[PDB]
Design a binder for this molecule. Structure first.
Ligand code: SF4
Ligand code: SF4
Ligand code: FES
Ligand code: FES
Lengths: 632, 632
């Protein structure tokens, strides 16, 4: 059962959100390893892999390149350090784009089934978004039923994954003509998403593409296939199926788990499952079932991006971010955690085996040995959701109440700020915020996104960067676990305006919004690309000229690499708070942080310090203001 | 210029083909590093990577799993050794399938351009193959022009890469119904190739698929998308465009390079380029151009799989296999080496910079820094080929004749044994070879394929396994660098029958074929799958019941991993002569070499010794004979 913890985690400085330390210590006293303990067990981590100068692409390896110059400078094949670093980064981009593309593909399948009248458990709820998106891609809407429009749109979207021509992706019709011309001159226009992923897997194959420039340019093309198509399709279809998010209020942090209620966690990414689970479990049938089993009711909380989806659409309380999933089971009050795929730590099974908690996997692509697999499908969605919630409610009597410790800490957060909601907040036009940017009332906008990584202090960089930006009158928007961190800290509560500078304070009180805008999940970074795209278009300007920046302060996933790359390729200066494994090559490092600005108009900037990164981002914003002839 | 060689390669036992030792020593005395020297510089290679128990799939890594049990047993995410090994192998399968799929995609593009009447430099030469393949996939041929049939076929083939349904790949119509039912029960039927590659990249993403069984089953599905579709399309369309190979004779080994002729090497994989280069350079215009430049003419030789393509179709002499590419430049007589993609050592540029040799890259996916890029396209194919051959001929005067050493060693080889050619050799029916298998005149058939790897003796396992099999009356067929090795040794010369056993000797003299059948390039392993598929179907039998085996004695590429996996999945016992990086996990090792036989009917078997592997393969063949009620 219990395990010997070899190295203990100094808990008082491990995290920036209240409750994480208590639960790490509870795990220690129970002998349960978390991600921090295993990170400590991994150290020292291999320097060659950390710098990206180790390749395992063929059986003649593994090969190490010594950047000291002490030992070997070339692999068995002859690959230098530049080639190996660029290829490994290309495969990271491929994997992130692939994750987002499979997400989009599942939502496309459900949307097409609804267009044909097959999945009657799912609606076309935003017919306006459907018609406008169909018109944007060249589909006439008038004279047609909603479902026929949806059928034609679905046919085009299905084809985004594998169309055979060298014509650009259809969804690129959402990108401004300036970005279009930039990508055309650079030759990075994506053609079909799965083809881009497969071509990266081919280029990195031994003896194919050894040039860092071409490798990274195709990485740019693949990231664009992700952001402006795959993730974009995911967001647009999730809005069409479950509603475009509008501003609402909810609760954040692990204080949302209840003592006298069945606690059901929804963890993962695809809302096709989580929306059904939440609606079924907060239905009154399951409420009285839980009362029959000795509870006051059923409380469903969310974690990570599927939690963000249910938070933005239904107001479901979000319990925590990435590195907190384990900790949620260590509260001792989780009857069941329902997962689909992406960023589901396998360790959550181990942890769950020291309690009563059931780890329910539901998707054929997300298997974890030891879990209980109840496969979800669209046609019998409500029945599977009922069965799952029933299993959780029936496990409720097994909760070891003697080992329950839920941290009190709970925070209010205003979420649901899609681009449509933001434009509605401005009176239906972009003009007031544009005037605020031109005056200097708002210096700029910064999108903060990304994961958690135990190599940096938990959620510290997220919140510190957000604070330092909003205090300098910079409107902060963001997605993902950054948004979970900001919500748990209080940066999205109605009083968060207190920490903003004078101009941001005045405008947030003039529009009744917080100074930090939760724009949704990791695929909802596409929303950011729309927002900037609108701004740049309203000002007769490219995205690269906007006084704006992006940041991933604590990233860890290959999805984050794809997101940062397509931010750069979209022309936004993009900061990384975790050092990508590229420092083993000077050429690749300067391409990433320098040479690529001339090509597409954005670039990377590595800085693990949140305050330093805030100063650099603010200086870049001031530079873009000076280039725009604006006041500073 | 020259380099200090830190460790010298014992050349007298380095290889099994004559001439390799002399050229390794010439490289040493010139200070030019080959793959062997850099392999020596890499040792000791990291044990964790060698056993597959090191993962770099996220920024929380790199993570090592200690199979000793000394240190950490789980990664930061919680992934055990089984998960990490299975995921890394899945990405190898993804990369190999992707390489073969991009190859097929380029040939599909050219074939579709010819169907529309656009690339008039390319013909429909095998209209019979075109019509039969179109009928096999449900396209009626009668009443239609050749080009219209080709258009409909191309539409179906284009869709193999990205069709949106969960329906199986169309090309699976070439697989027997028994394999169909096996794959259906296992649930590994491939749907769309690029989707399979992208789904592997998604499953191996952090926190998605952690179960080794599901990971490896999707690897099986992806390998099937490669072998029975992508590689199959590549082979079928290459035959339709450039002719189905028929038996012919040619020369092998580095003795085919001439002293008084311009020497042009074609290296790579896609014949769209190499056929044009060979035809243009052996045209009389370039012959008199080379005479004007002081040479007797132009001699074009091939290396690796594109060399195998031009060898099977035109009789172009093949100069060597994988590990010999560098050595070909060290002869000092190569005016130009023309490469497209796949297994092009970047080091060949370095080596070429110590001579006059020009490394010409021609494909947008195959860039090598320092090379000269003359991009090839179908519409201006003949003009680009003329320009390239002219550059080689004009470089001829720069050959340092003082530093020229071409090994005399040259061997005759009978190549061009496609399935059609083999059936034509048997009188148009499969009955004589089936009778020979039933009698015991031929014990079985074994396909030998794969790469070269300097960790094992060069070409030694290829030739030794082929010899040990044919001496026990086992018909040896094979592709790729195994076929180059067999051709250079003499196992495909008319006298090779001398080394065969009595039954194989009698039947090869009765049909005037060698005991070793060159069936083409790495994609032409699809031919093998057809052959077995025919045999199994003629006997009313599954492929798994045939007295047959496959082997990759010296593999190194991820393409080889995909090929071996889809051989296994096709039901053939498949031997590996190089240990895959899986031994860090007992569960994955037993799935690969044991548990998977119950699922699909084949399995892996690791044995780096060629004689041991020959005995095991022969015993498995005898087992399959006993199960068939045949004599032993
Ligand atoms: S691709 Fe080259 S550098 Fe990478 S492992 Fe293979 S031989 Fe070594
Ligand atoms: S996926 Fe897991 S095992 Fe692999 S590097 Fe990431 S944290 Fe370590
Ligand atoms: S030697 Fe450490 S990542 Fe390969
Ligand atoms: S530690 Fe050697 S392959 Fe990663």
């Amino acid at each position: 059962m219990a395990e010997y913890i070899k190295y203990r985690v100094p808990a008082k400085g491990v995290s920036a959100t209240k409750g994480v330390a208590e639960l790490i210590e509870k795990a220690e006293e129970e002998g349960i390893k978390t991600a921090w303990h295993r990170l400590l067990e991994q150290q020292p981590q291999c320097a060659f892999g950390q710098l990206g100068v180790c390749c395992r692409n063929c059986a003649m390896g593994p090969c190490r390149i010594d950047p000291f110059g002490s030992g070997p400078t070339k692999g068995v094949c002859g690959a230098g350090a530049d080639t190996i670093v660029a290829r490994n980064l290309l495969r990271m981009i491929a994997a992130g784009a692939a994750a987002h593309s499979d997400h989009a593909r599942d939502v496309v399948e459900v949307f097409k089934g609804v267009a044909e009248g097959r999945f009657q458990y799912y609606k076309l709820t935003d017919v306006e978004k459907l018609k406008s998106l169909a018109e944007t891609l060249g589909i006439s809407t008038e004279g047609k039923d909603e479902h026929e429009i949806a059928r034609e749109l679905a046919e085009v979207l299905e084809w985004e994954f594998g169309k055979p021509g060298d014509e650009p992706l259809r969804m690129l019709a959402l990108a401004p003509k300036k970005r279009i011309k930039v990508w055309e001159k650079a030759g990075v226009l994506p053609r079909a998403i799965d083809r881009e992923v497969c071509e990266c897997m081919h280029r990195t194959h031994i003896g194919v593409d050894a040039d860092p420039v071409s490798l990274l340019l195709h990485g740019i093309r693949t990231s664009l296939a992700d952001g402006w198509s795959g993730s974009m399709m995911a967001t647009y279809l999730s809005d069409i199926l479950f509603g475009t998010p509008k501003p609402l209020k909810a609760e954040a942090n692990l204080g949302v788990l209840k003592e006298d209620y069945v606690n059901i966690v929804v963890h993962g990414h695809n809302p096709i499952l989580s929306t059904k689970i939440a609606e079924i479990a907060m239905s009154e049938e399951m409420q009285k079932f839980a009362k029959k089993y000795g509870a006051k009711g059923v409380n469903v909380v969310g974690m990570c991006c599927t939690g963000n989806e249910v938070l933005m659409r239904l107001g479901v309380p979000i319990a925590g971010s990435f590195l907190m999933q384990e900790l949620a089971i260590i509260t001792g009050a989780v009857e069941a955690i329902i997962v689909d795929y992406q960023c589901i730590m396998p360790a959550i099974v181990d942890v769950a085996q020291c309690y009563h908690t059931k780890v329910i996997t539901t998707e054929p692509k997300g298997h974890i040995p030891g879990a209980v697999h109840i496969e979800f499908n669209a046609e019998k969605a409500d029945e599977i959701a009922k069965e799952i919630v029933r299993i959780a409610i029936e496990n409720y009597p097994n909760r070891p109440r003697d080992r329950v410790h839920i941290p009190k800490h709970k925070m209010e957060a205003i979420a649901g700020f899609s681009v449509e909601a933001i434009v509605e907040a401005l009176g239906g036009t972009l003009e007031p915020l544009i005037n605020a940017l031109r005056d200097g009332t708002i210096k700029g906008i910064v999108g903060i996104v990304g994961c958690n990584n135990p190599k940096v202090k938990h959620n510290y960089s997220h919140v510190t960067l957000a604070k330092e930006l909003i205090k300098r009158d910079v409107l902060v928007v963001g997605t993902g676990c950054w948004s979970i961190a900001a919500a748990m800290e209080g940066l999205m509560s109605p009083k968060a305006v207190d920490l903003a500078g004078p101009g941001l304070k005045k405008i947030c009180e003039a529009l009744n919004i917080p100074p930090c805008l939760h724009m949704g999940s990791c695929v909802d970074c596409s929303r950011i690309l729309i927002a900037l795209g609108a701004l740049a278009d309203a000002l007769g300007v490219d995205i690269s000229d906007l006084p704006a920046a992006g940041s991933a302060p604590e990233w860890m996933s290959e999805k984050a690499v794809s997101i940062g790359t397509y931010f750069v390729a979209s022309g936004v200066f993009t900061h990384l708070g975790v050092v990508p494994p590229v420092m083993g090559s000077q050429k690749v490092a300067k391409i990433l942080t320098e040479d690529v600005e001339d090509i597409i108009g954005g670039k990377f900037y590595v800085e693990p310090d949140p305050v330093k990164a805030a100063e650099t981002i603010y200086n870049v914003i001031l530079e873009k203001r000076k280039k725009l002839g604006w006041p500073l």
